[PDB]
Design a binder for this molecule. Structure first.
Ligand code: A1CMB
Length: 166
């Protein structure tokens, strides 16, 4: 299957009201982005959901990556297997502003997307990380230069995001 049902916000950013787990299972994109933490512990939010959809194969692989390479930096990323969701998973660490991490690092986090021509992604630093989701979409639009398909689960949030752009 291919991406379908997205609204084009800019020349390279698309958005859909969808559960990113269901989009990944259907489309099996070349790259799905995980909203990760520095130790790749996929406990809640989108990370917990993507890891559960791989039946914990993502966490076992992530633990081996950490033991061999050490933790990521905030604003950094690594490429691991996408398992059943994608060819690759790009694990990207946005700042956790609820813990005093600098919001400037949200631009650095999205810059990691530019190494891939097409990605399926969530909004970074939204949810448990505490950033305003409409600010996260603005940083995405201002920073990502490649084609990004953003999936937003919550209908109320999706409608707010689309209204801020159109
Ligand atoms: N299967 C899924 N579990 C989750 C968990 C969290 C989310 C989040 C957002 C949303 O797109 O609505 C914004 C903040 C967190 C999405 C999904 S899809």
């Amino acid at each position: 299957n291919s991406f379908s049902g997205y609204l084009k916000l800019t020349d390279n950013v698309y958005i859909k009201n969808a559960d990113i787990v269901e989009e990944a299972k259907k489309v099996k994109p070349t790259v799905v982005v995980n909203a990760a933490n520095v130790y790749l512990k996929h406990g809640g939010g989108v990370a917990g959901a993507l890891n559960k959809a791989t039946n914990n194969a993502m966490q076992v692989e992530s633990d081996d990556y950490i033991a061999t390479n050490g933790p990521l930096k905030v604003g950094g990323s690594c490429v691991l297997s996408g398992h059943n969701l994608a060819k690759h998973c790009l694990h990207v660490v946005g700042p956790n502003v609820n813990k005093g991490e600098d919001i400037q690092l949200l631009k650095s986090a999205y810059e990691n997307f530019n190494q891939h021509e097409v990605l399926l992604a969530p909004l970074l630093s939204a949810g448990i990380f505490g950033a305003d989701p409409i600010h996260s979409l603005r940083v995405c639009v201002d920073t990502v230069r490649t084609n990004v398909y953003l999936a937003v689960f919550d209908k109320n949030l999706y409608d707010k995001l689309v209204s801020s752009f159109l």
